[PDB]
Amino acid sequence: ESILVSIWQNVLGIEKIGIRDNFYSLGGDSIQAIQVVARLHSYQLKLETKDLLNYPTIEQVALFVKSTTRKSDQGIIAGNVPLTPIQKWFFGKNFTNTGHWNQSSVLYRPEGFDPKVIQSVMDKIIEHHDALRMVYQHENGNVVQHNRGLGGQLYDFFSYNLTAQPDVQQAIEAETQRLHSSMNLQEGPLVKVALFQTLHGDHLFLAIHHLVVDGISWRILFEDLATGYAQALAGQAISLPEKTDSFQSWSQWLQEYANEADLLSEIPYWESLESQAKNVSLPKDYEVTDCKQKSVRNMRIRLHPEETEQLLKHANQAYQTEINDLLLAALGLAFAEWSKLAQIVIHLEGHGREDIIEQANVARTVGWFTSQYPVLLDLKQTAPLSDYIKLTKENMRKIPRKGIGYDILKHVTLPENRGSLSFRVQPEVTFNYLGQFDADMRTELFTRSPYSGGNTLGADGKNNLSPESEVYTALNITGLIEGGELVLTFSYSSEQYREESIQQLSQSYQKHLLAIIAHCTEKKEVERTPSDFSVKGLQMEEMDDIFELLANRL
Amino acid sequence: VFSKEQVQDMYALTPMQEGMLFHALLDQEHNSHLVQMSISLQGDLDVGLFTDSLHVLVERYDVFRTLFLYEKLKQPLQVVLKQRPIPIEFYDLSACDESEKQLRYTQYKRADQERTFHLAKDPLMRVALFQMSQHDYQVIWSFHHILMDGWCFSIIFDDLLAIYLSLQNKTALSLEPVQPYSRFINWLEKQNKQAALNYWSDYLEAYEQKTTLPKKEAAFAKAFQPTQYRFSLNRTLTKQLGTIASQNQVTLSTVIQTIWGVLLQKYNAAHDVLFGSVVSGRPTDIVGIDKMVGLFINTIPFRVQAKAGQTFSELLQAVHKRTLQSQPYEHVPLYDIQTQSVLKQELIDHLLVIENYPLVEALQKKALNQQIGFTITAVEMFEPTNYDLTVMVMPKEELAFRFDYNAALFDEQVVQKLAGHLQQIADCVANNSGVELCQIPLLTEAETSQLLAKRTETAADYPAATMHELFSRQAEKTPEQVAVVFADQHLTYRELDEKSNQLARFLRKKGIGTGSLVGTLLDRSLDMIVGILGVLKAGGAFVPIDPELPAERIAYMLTHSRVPLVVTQNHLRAKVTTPTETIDINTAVIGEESRAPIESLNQPHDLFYIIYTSGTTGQPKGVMLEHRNMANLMHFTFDQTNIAFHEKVLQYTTCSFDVCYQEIFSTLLSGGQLYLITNELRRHVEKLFAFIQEKQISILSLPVSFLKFIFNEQDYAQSFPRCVKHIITAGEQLVVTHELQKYLRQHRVFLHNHYGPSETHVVTTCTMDPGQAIPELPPIGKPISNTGIYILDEGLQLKPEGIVGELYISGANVGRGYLHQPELTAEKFLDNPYQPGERMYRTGDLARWLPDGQLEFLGRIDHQVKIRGHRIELGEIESRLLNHPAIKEAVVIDRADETGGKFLCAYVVLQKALSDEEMRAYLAQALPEYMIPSFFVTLERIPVTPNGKTDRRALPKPEGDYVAPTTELEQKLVAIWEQILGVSPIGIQDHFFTLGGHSLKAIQLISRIQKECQADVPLRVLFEQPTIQALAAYVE
Ligand SMILES: *P(=O)(O)OCC(C)(C)[C@@H](O)C(=O)NCCNC(=O)Cc1ccc(C2=C3CC[C@@H](OC(=O)NCCNC(=O)CCNC(=O)[C@H](O)C(C)(C)COP(*)(=O)O)CCC[C@H]3C(C)=NN2)cc1
Ligand SMILES: Nc1ncnc2c1ncn2[C@@H]1O[C@H](COP(=O)(O)O)[C@@H](O)[C@H]1O
Fold it and tell me: Which residues carry this modification: O-(pantetheine 4'-phosphoryl)serine (chain A)?
């Protein structure tokens, strides 16, 4: 390539270098190679000098020139998509009426939301993001995903005027309740859209089957919708950001990664977990083994805005925890008081996307990446609160790759690789902490409809899971910040637990979380723990030795 | 006071910092580990802003605020502090005497080079400023090696000047973010360790014998004294090497490394040599690593190996490819690479370092790039240096070399010559790229002419008459005297002459003469000397045979000789089963021959004498001397030996071996008297010494086995004769026992040691010992008149004094060749390459010139044992065994297992029974564990050939190491050993590095000790005595 010739000329100094002259014959060395590569990368081309030396001719090294950044395939893509771990989990959980398992929101726009504009935007949205096209065929009694092309019928659309009814909220609620029943997973759009007109402005309902979307994917979809509507209002060509690596390729690289020995290196950790979790259990107010979503009840507890700001700004520093570490330590103490169990296991939803494949960028990728892993919280030594928060901090750091590996081993690694793993601990309890709501209210061009209804993104959403679906987890605990306050939601099945026992559990949570926020804000020093320092396998028994030796030496 | 707030970070040490922490903990004769950049600045310099800029430089780089903590840890750590100011001493001397100022400055600068950093307790930099005038400042900036590669200083000084400029111009710092050394640590933990150890174990695989350079002296003391020498190649020779490199597709560093390779080959025997190469160790895979301040510089083994037919270009290609294949793995620490090798340590003992950019010049150009008020006017550097030798090369305009060397170990003449040879190699390589490695000469004209002068010196002019003509001209001098006595019967010289004339006149009637040869299968008698001399006067060559030989071997020798005629006694006529005429020497017709002198009818040039050697051929082969060969020896023996003339000589060597005829002609032509002795009496030392003393014999000649052994036969050695004045010996590597020492010292017998292939003569060099002082392994001495002697390599090239090579022998002693199987002759016999017109014989011996001009013998080229990387002189182990009071006679051999794995074993005969350890300890007093024999075999008698040489064939095959007992007393160290080593239960006398320990696990060991107990022990202890029992001196 001419660029590479030009670098050789203006680095080796010799002019007129031929297309296959020899780097060592021209007088290169371990330094002229560095000068070539450093110069070359200015053109965004990359070349390890190992290749420049080993293939010391222009004609031979050019076969190893690369672009520094990959261009992710922005084309239209289609075809077979392997199940990801969470999709395989979904089909393996085998709900009744799987065609009604959704996420949604209701948007609002005071000045109106003209149907043709939002239609054109959703069209471009579904042209752009491929995974929203998939269908799930139940071929041969197994399941396979087909990523459809642009063969029309991207999404179902509906439009309504509610001004004839005074109680517009009830009408829009009942209609969105209707739409949730209509996901033809084998053949049809997985995105449903409805627009409700009203004198106070237009309301826009989005609903999407959960198999193809996620909270991060909703933040993306909203800000892309905002920029798309800005383009449509400006009348310019709707032109979304550069497509990041499409979910098909993520599924492929994951299936490839799922059999690498790298993941299997985690296997002794998850074994050391499961071999200890063997006798994990959770009590029930009544002996029952299945429930339906209509049996689920939820209740909320709040901290005051002052305590929420203290938790957000000051409670972390005293231990270099992050927010998750404190909420989860409080959950540990809550169960330690309420259950009086020696141990408990909690399942957490990571956002996935854990940089598992170095060439994979998914920052703009719509899909269901939610990655589930169990964690065992120790409850035996709750007395020294100074240490319980340290212990919980460290266990959260021992989890490899923040837990993306475990459900690959459960669902995708070929079963000879996955060793002794039993996979027979189940999510009786789960905890998650969302960010702020600001993923929804991210922009002023439109906002959350005051008639939001039961159609929230969160597990407090009423309509988005079908009333006949089975309750897959007994306690679902989610935290979020709104109005400047932390809101905790506890979900339970009315047939497994009664109201008084969840009022107990939720107060025994609020108590210990306020205790922890006070304790850690009052502590004015900073302490640190072995995970802070960058010494592999350093321990409390050793870090406080090193800090003893320094204090003695100096 | 300390607070936990202050620590920024911790790390495990990188392999380089691990190695340098070990090094810094090892030594305490000095702890000079340091660098002292010393920079002279003229002009205007605001010392306040300089101070500030140094404080901002120490804040900028985390590696300058690093401290290394190891005192009690499982594993050394870097601890990085958030704040740690460095000392900045300042001394305004501008008001001081020019006579004082330079002294005060020099005294300080030299004192600072002595001020050792404490790797934990002190900041690892200093700066000092001396203001010498209104516009003159000198900076001293000592720092520790462990902080950074010294060349990193070019970065640090650039940042420092940028900071100073920013402060002077009140302008924001433009410096980029620091490329953090932790970025490389991550990459070191990402990399697969075992793939690289499994490569380096392959690279070293066949490394049979360690490289050497001629160290002057043993480590009698750590008299280390850092010394230097430097030189450079001419402009043209350098750009010629550049042309070679650019034509061969290799770097100039590869050409330089190959030239140093070929040099180390020619300086050794080997075709396979390994030395340390120092490489930047910065993996190009890292982003920005060429700006990363830290410790990267690494030592790798570099191996150059050649085929015999390989051109230098073909070695260039091979060493280039071997370098590229190594590059992915050059970050591995040498302490682990050494563990991959059968040389578990001492794999490398000198370095070749190539540096395209020295720090001076590079630094000396910097401040010229900035408008600041001062100019850096000079710079110096100082670096205490590890190795005994280090060849720096700077590929400057004139390719310049420098040998940093410890002059306590290399003589300046050794290094001066080494640089001469290194230039002569480079010139040969530079003129023809395609010369064979065998054909490159090391020697300049000044050495070539000086060695060849040893042929032209000790030339001598002699009458070169025929051997029987010399006898006749002697016999006319004193014919009436008794020449020979056998049993109790004697002949005069007259009677010997008359009988020889009679027998020669008779033998000529059988056609014997110039075209003819005679077999002389005669047993010892007066008739034997008469027989020889008569056959000589018959003018044909005489072919003696030992009656004690196998009849099949006798018949082989006869038929292969094509001998028509055999002379014997009557009883031997049955031995001659061959179709050959057999003459009774007693036949009365010989009494009728005319007794007056027979005419001399063959000439000194013609064939004379033939005997049959052993060898690698299953057939014995006959080597034939010409008369000129013995005549040349006789005149030298008269001219230049202390052997007395009118003297009585014991004949001992049997007629099958040429020293017999060294006895015979040397006795007769000196006019002495041959005392013959009956064949078997050689078996009866109690009768030999009785005869010698009762006959008052004045001269003896003894095989080497007689000297080694019979003087330890205490009852007889304490009864040894004292009438003897001179002893002659030859045939085997001579060894003098402590008993033989005491006897020679008391009796002051002149011992003469002679050497020769027999294919010339078993004398062609000699030395002689007045009994005043005697080495344990005497040399084989000087060449002799009209003998040329050369130590050559496989190319027939001369090789320098002090280097080993093939001992070619030349001049008047060189025989005609082989009587039959003459097709072998052209392999062994050739013209002297350096001087046509002289014959030369290719001895299979190695030898070395000693600087005093004596010649050293090194055994056969086939037997260079090179056990487990090391060469061994078996004579040293033999010396130690033979000087044991219990051992009478002993031998050592390179045996091998039935897989072909060589091992040392000893064959021994003793005055008492004793345990294996009762001699093994007696060796361990002095001999390294690569050269103590693995097994000891007890025998009744060592097999000897009647020539007296030991026989490797007749000793029995062996039957059936460091292994040691678990003689536990306290397990504490054993538990420490077991937990660190993990590989085995540990013997209390067992060896840490033999157990697979290495330099760094030794520090892990001691750091464990000094926490698991309130104990300490200097690291050198674990290298002086690498055993658990070594710490018995330290537990209390
Ligand atoms: P291209 O090939 O040109 O290279 C790329 C560039 C960009 C040029 C890059 O390399 C660069 O910028 N250049 C850097 C400088 N020049 C070079 O090219 C490389 C170079 C480095 C250093 C020098 C000089 C040296 C050599 C450095 C030191 O060498 C030395 O003796 N080693 C340190 C001593 N420490 C040890 O203990 C040895 C290593 N550890 C061991 O394995 C020991 O054997 C143990 C510890 C005993 C093992 O324990 P146990 O298991 O046995 C110091 C010597 C001399 C210096 C000096 C003064 N001059 N330069 C030159 C070039
Ligand atoms: N005095 C001696 N010292 C050392 N080696 C000798 C001596 N005499 C003979 N040899 C060696 O033995 C071989 C010749 O043996 P021979 O021809 O039987 O004397 C050659 O390898 C010689 O180098």
Answer: 30
